Design an enzyme around this catalytic site. Sequence first.
Site, PDB file in Angstrom:
ATOM      1  N   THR A   1       0.842  -1.241   0.000  1.00 19.42           N
ATOM      2  CA  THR A   1       0.000   0.000   0.000  1.00 19.42           C
ATOM      3  C   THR A   1       0.860   1.267   0.000  1.00 19.42           C
ATOM      4  OG1 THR A   1      -1.915  -1.045   1.087  1.00 19.42           O
ATOM      5  CG2 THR A   1      -1.759   1.349   1.307  1.00 19.42           C
TER       6      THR A   1
ATOM      7  N   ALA B   1      -8.343  -2.965   5.695  1.00 21.34           N
ATOM      8  CA  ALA B   1      -9.278  -2.532   4.644  1.00 21.34           C
ATOM      9  C   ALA B   1     -10.702  -2.350   5.176  1.00 21.34           C
ATOM     10  CB  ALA B   1      -9.278  -3.523   3.489  1.00 21.34           C
TER      11      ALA B   1
END
Lengths: 195, 195, 223, 204, 125, 196, 196, 212, 222, 233
Positions: free
Chosen positions: H1, H49
């Site tokens: 990420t 998430a």
Amino acid sequence: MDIILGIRVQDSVILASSKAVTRGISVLKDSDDKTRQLSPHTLMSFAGEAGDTVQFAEYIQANIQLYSIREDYELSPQAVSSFVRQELAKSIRSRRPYQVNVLIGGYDKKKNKPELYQIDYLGTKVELPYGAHGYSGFYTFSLLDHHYRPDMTTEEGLDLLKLCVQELEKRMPMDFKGVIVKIVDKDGIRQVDDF
Amino acid sequence: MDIILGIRVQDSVILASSKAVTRGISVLKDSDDKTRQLSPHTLMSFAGEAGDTVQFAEYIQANIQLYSIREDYELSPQAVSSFVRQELAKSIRSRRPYQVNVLIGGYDKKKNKPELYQIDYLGTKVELPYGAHGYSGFYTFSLLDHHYRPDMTTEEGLDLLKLCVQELEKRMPMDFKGVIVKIVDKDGIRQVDDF
Amino acid sequence: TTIAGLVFQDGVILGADTRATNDSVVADKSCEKIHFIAPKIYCCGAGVAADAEAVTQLIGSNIELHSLYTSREPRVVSALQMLKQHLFKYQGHIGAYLIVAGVDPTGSHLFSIHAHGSTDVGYYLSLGSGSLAAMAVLESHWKQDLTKEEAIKLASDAIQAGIWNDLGSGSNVDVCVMEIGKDAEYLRNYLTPNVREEKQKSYKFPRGTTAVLKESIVNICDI
Amino acid sequence: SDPSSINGGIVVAMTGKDCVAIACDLRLGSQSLGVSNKFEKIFHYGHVFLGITGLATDVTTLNEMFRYKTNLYKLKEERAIEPETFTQLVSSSLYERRFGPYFVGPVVAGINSKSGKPFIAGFDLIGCIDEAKDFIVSGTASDQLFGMCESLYEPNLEPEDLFETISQALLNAADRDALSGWGAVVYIIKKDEVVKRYLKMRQD
Amino acid sequence: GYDRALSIFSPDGHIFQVEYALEAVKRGTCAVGVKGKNCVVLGCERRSTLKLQDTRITPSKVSKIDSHVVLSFSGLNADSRILIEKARVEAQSHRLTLEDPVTVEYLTRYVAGVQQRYTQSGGVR
Amino acid sequence: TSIMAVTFKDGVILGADSRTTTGAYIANRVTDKLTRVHDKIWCCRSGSAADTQAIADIVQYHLELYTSQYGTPSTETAASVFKELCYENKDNLTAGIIVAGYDDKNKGEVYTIPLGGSVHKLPYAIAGSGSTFIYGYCDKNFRENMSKEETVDFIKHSLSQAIKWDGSSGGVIRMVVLTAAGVERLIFYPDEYEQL
Amino acid sequence: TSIMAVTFKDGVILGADSRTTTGAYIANRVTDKLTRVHDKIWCCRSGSAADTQAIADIVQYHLELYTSQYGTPSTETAASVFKELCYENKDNLTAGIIVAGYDDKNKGEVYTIPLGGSVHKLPYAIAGSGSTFIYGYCDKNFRENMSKEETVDFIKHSLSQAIKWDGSSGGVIRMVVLTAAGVERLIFYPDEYEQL
Amino acid sequence: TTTLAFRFQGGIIVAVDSRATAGNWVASQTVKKVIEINPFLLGTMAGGAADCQFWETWLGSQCRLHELREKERISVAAASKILSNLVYQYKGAGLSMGTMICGYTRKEGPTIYYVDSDGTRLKGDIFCVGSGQTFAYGVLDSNYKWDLSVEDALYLGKRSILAAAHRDAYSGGSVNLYHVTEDGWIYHGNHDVGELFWKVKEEEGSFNNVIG
Amino acid sequence: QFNPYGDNGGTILGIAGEDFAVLAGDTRNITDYSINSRYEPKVFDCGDNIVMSANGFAADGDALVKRFKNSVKWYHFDHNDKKLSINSAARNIQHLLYGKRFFPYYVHTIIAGLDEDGKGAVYSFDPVGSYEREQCRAGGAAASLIMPFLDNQVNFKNQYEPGTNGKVKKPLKYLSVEEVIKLVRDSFTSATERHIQVGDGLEILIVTKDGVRKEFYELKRD
Amino acid sequence: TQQPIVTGTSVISMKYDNGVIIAADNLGSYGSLLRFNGVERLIPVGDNTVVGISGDISDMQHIERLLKDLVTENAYDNPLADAEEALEPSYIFEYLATVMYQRRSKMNPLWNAIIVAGVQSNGDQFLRYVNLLGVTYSSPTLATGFGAHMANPLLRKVVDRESDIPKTTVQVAEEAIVNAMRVLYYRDARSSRNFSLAIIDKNTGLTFKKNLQVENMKWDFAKDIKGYGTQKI
Ligand SMILES: [Mg+2]
Ligand SMILES: [Mg+2]
Ligand SMILES: [Mg+2]
Ligand SMILES: [Mg+2]
């Protein structure tokens, strides 16, 4: 030891290595030279576990100097890096391994080319245009990927290196007390005394 | 959070607190103010676990501001520090304790005296001429023990503080990105913008 | 793995499946788990596949040198003794589980051998993750004085039970029949019950589909 | 921590009609950090090709070891080693380190110079031989490669068709693995010519 | 707990307890508010039945809720202290969570809401 | 495992069940736990099957070499060789062995060698996981100088109970009789001993 | 601990040793492990002394309150109350209880409640650490509808062996006889039972 | 990420990668790591998430209730603090969150708050969060100015994710760009890193180390 | 110690077409190296033209599907028999999953159907409720074997047009329901060969404007 | 969280053309001690259902009481309790499956594996499994514990798929079940010779067989086996 950087430009290899030596709570020294001259046109910078770093570096230095006297000949940077890799690869399955990461910057007088080799403590060798060990690459590689050209001068290589060190000084938590910078070219090894 | 220093001179209390906020690998900020004004003549600096520090400081600030409005009166620094100590002492036997260390610098308008209180996360309170939390005292207390006088001016207190910060910048491994300095006296609280 | 061994009228027979699995993926769909020790001595290998192959080859090499030295055909008890003493020495660290069978001047023999070096004598045996499925079949149908045709049937039935009901076992059945006064017959792919069905589509690409940066000729020829 | 997935990378080998193909990615990493995009994992000793995935120091060490051994083999035998014989040499050499193994996934590919027969083989880290007719896979995206190969592969492909099949198997497998990619190489091997092709792929 | 419905509708659609609370307000000392162009003034009556009073310490009729908002009242003095306390707490809670002091309308809406709640809760007047 | 050896008038009898387990799975239901180290010196094995087989094979080698040089070894000598291996390698062995033998001079003798590698000469011995359930029975029913038929019944009844209660024991009851007359093997099936 | 209860023609007899140990130290050599929850419903206790005493006291309370409302409870009812406490608190208890009682309708009944809190109605039951050594003996020697004297001998001989082999068991053999005639306590000393 | 956000003359740029991994396995290349809290507020996804999606969707509900009750747009300060106070209640339970709450109001101007699952709430001008954060910071720090144009700022955010996508093994797939103004956010497209890399390499002359 | 979770194997696959959607799953149920069932349905019609599968730990999978089906029933009661759209179903499932954030349903959930414009839709969930609309998504044991193949054959990744040599991508042409089913079948056949937990049978549920249809295919039983 | 103390081993079962068969041995083991020899582990519910239970016996006795209470409760204010509103196998199973999953979700499981065998109102065969985790599945053959590894392979040779069910008679199905019980006795160290067997048939109803024994056992070959390798005597 913390930050060691390397960059291979047109006609030279530049190695930049931090000056701090920290033993836990206190910074014991702020002028430490984390490098050994292996031969007149080959320099090795190092970082890893305390004691093991210098012991390894000086052991390599002794063996290359021994080779030089025996044959009256300087080994190529490639040959020196292969010798160093084997010693580290031997080390990793020992009773107590050398925890030492190295960069080998050399000027090959036969080919008239600068060469930079990155070798970690496992004996993982790679030839690169620029390299680092530990967390140093995480901060600097995005800048090097952007700005690096193979036809850079030594002065342009130093300017790109200043930008890398500035980024390290901004975003790294540890105070590494600046860097000693050394240049390896056809004339040998010299230190940039103002950086 | 890292370094918080306090020094009580003749007519004021000076609090110096580091600007760095580090989240593991990167320094996310280099201008963080680790302090809250509790009342016009009382300032609290803080350091400890992330999140808990600010949550605690603002919770204290709200309660003292509530007291001020209810009684139309400013609590003495001693009274504020006792309130803060009790909240931390309550906290230590909780389900999840506040891991927060504080310094409370205040000017008592009744007695016409500066006052500095040091309180750790356990609720250990001490009134001091100078104080610190964490490793900050290890570097600075030998200088403060040597140079400190109870009749120092504010300017002499700031000069002694510069010497403490210089020693921290020399011997600490972490880069704390300098300090914000604030002075608490009879006229209230103000920030020294150049340090 | 499912491996089995059983004795019949004038012989002994070995069976094995042909699947090799590392974790939950099938590494090999057609591997040979029946190992050669001597012309008439064979070994089914279960457990760690490398270890079972390596230990049979070492003992098979030493058995051959012994046979040459003594001018006699090798015995199954010699292979058994050499395997167990080797496995015992390594205290189970060589994770080989083996079923050894053969014919020699003494007669026909069937043994099992565990990783720590224990041996067993039996009329019918099974090893591996499919051993319980295989042994259910053998306990249901094995009898004394089986004929060769009955024995091959039972051995393959025992391996099939493992193939269908054990996720560790699969693919084909390998058999080896060792009968007295006869050459041993190694029947690889004796059964083939798991051929893949024809695919719905052909995935052959048009030429030039892949993007290429550089092309070069590799010199493999001697200088 | 897991030595086989520190550096990352993949190798795949396939057989075709009178030919073999072997291919690999070019990434070398230190876990999340990409270090090199030129770390080739395929080597050759005469006409025998050896791909090696896994711990990169052992990849380099084993290459230097098999170069050593195949050089001495050649001097004594007065002929180049064949794929079948080399496969046994790789297996022997790995198993001699049974209780302190090299963390690698070697793959052999080549054509027997006398019979003309295409040959491929794969090994686990201690030398267990998988001698497949169809294909061999190895590395951190070996699951992805198994999925590609099992659907894309058909037998007796011509060299230039086999190139497309093995390339698409490698590329799409590598793009579903964090620790593989950063370039790729494909060797197409025939009895007396070998072509080497570098592929264009996404560099993330 | 005491749950008795004290505030309830009568046949004519009135809630007498709420209307009798207004009669308590009618009895309270007069309070007045006037807003100019750039200020607001709050005037309050102090009944002169009570002399010998100590005006330093006697509860003042105008109360600060925050540094920028004030509250005066007419009616039961003891009841007003409960509304003033709740308002002061809400003012600091608003500063703590929204990072901004209350608007005058917001603070009014809160106090008015507390007053409403006590007209349809069990066991309270 | 349920194993025992019992001295009687004419010599000694060794007895054993035939079950070998890997956890709750019966890996072998027809195991032979009565093993021969010399012509008339046998042993019962309990513990690690690898260890006890490795030991017994070494002892058999030692007594074969003893016999070539010095003639027939005593049962005491056999027990001593077992003990030496068990005691010196106690850290790396899990072996519980009962040694039983017949001399013409000494007649029937029984020696038990538990985990530690100690030696205990006894009139009879019991061992293995199933032996716990028959300490009471065996102590109440054993007599010295029983006949062959009485001793066979004693061992049959004893191991019958050991099998009944111990999940680790089962199968057939094997026995080996050691006398001047020679070496006799006996076997007893479930339908015989379960109804006792 | 060695405990048992045995049904016979006239009713039931509970038997127990008297040893309580803390490790290898005998904390009490004259313990009474036969405990009364109702006039003719008793129990034998094994496991945690704290737990089994706490349970037995609660049961005695439940059966006393039962009796005030509904008259004399059955042995099955007593076993059920024991089970309810043992089963519902299985995570926090180490209790192995044998419940024995005499009705005139049902005569002698025995229920065993092992660690899990299951219930098993049996002709006789054995429990405690020392019971392992007498499974063989008890199975071979128990008969249904024994006399009082035969059952006393059976329990005496059984617990004698349990005591002999188990270090955790010892002391005196206490017994409680439950019949239509009433409640009789018996005691047997070491010099009596050791020579059996 | 790799997620970043930075304040400038023309508002806020938000740029994120698109990759999700489970160990070495690349689960998705098409993850939406910018959460559209409402038409004026954006949040970024890093760490967990679910934790980021759920609680920043929930945050949008609280912001909507605020403006219904108060008849006024919620401030970025108040919005960020609703989220930080919520996650602070769950501290110790194992929430995983590193997010930039981004908005542009009248009273504040363009504002970014870094909010985090151990309770941290920081106002700042430039933030980078994720496994590739250090790479993005390098490009940002050396090229950032307040007086960047909207076009140049968008490129800088795009280029900084590309830097991380190249080097960081757990970052890549595609780049999502947003530009936050006072009148609301504006989406500036999904850009495949594969196609972007070669385009940038050629046009910029960077990545000479890589053969193309 | 008591472990409240288990792994029942299985592999599932959702593909969104232009005006249709498929959700496929193998019918094998396992624990460790044993087969529990060769035919245990894993993909379910939940009403309102939505199909669902919760692959992983089968007990949590059954619980979630059961709760979602019930959520569809109560949506009808509470909102005047309104059809639950696929996007609304997805958001509802997030709240069901996140409701157990600190003791999760150990499953990878996929739903499929049509959006409110009649276009094919697939939504994918992690165990704690993070979700996304997707064109193509495999879940479970053999997901790593299937997805690279689908990138290549559905989205045409790494495929370029012959003669251009990397310059022009292969154009993303729309696949029919028959074409998608061929790719599903070949994915599972390949997965069966190389993954021990995949096999026995393949059940595919196809969703169009006309309703939900089922297709079943044999897979290798070894 | 607990551990099982007194335990029951395999329950095995299969479908045949007109109904279902289920079987289980009569043993309650206490670790390696074969403690209790008269434990019934097949528990009938009405005349159309049999619940076979393995694992912890104390939890089995709790489940037995729940089922008994279920029958009582169903009869309350139910004139059709012995007709249209009688308990079905599917009702009994779903109830147990709910309890098992709820108990595991509170981290306090009933430490069992359960097979509910029966015949529905419409004549359909019912056979479904549930365990301590709340995991459920159905198949033409079902077995718990060792039965899963040894009985299923044998029973699957008779009924390998759904279409084999109408071709399998009650004589063939019982024979296969009885043989599987013998194999388990040979090979499972926590099994017994004595077992119970239940047949639920849509025509002939519930036949419950107690005190069955494993017979026709092969042991004779044991006499010839000698030593562990080289021994000849
Ligand atoms: Mg990749
Ligand atoms: Mg990347
Ligand atoms: Mg005693
Ligand atoms: Mg299988």
